[PDB]
C-alpha cells in the first residue's frame, strides 16, 4: 500500500499546519514570530491599516 | 542626485525577492523546510547573487 503526501506551500492562506500551540500575543517588544507559516524577527503593533 | 540614489537603493532592495536559482529567496523558509547538508546548497546560490 502506498501513500502519496503532495502539499503546497506560500501561495495563499495556510489550511494545513502541524499540532504546536499558538501563544498570548505579544505587543511593543522585538519578538521572534509566526502567523500561518509567516515568519521573521520583529515589533509587532496595533495596525489602522 | 536624489532620484538615482533613491532608484539604486531601490533596486537593491527588490533584489532581495529574487531566487538566482535557489527554491526561494526567503532564507527562514529554506531553512524551515530543509535541513542542514540540503539547506546550504540553496543558501549558496542566495549568497553568490
Redesign the interface.
Known sequence: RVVVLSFE??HAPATVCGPKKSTNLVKNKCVNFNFNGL??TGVLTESNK | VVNQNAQALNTLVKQLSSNFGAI?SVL??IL??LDKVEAEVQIDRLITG
Do not use: E, F, V, W
Open positions: 506551500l506560500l515568519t521573521g | 526561494s527562514n523558509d524551515s523546510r
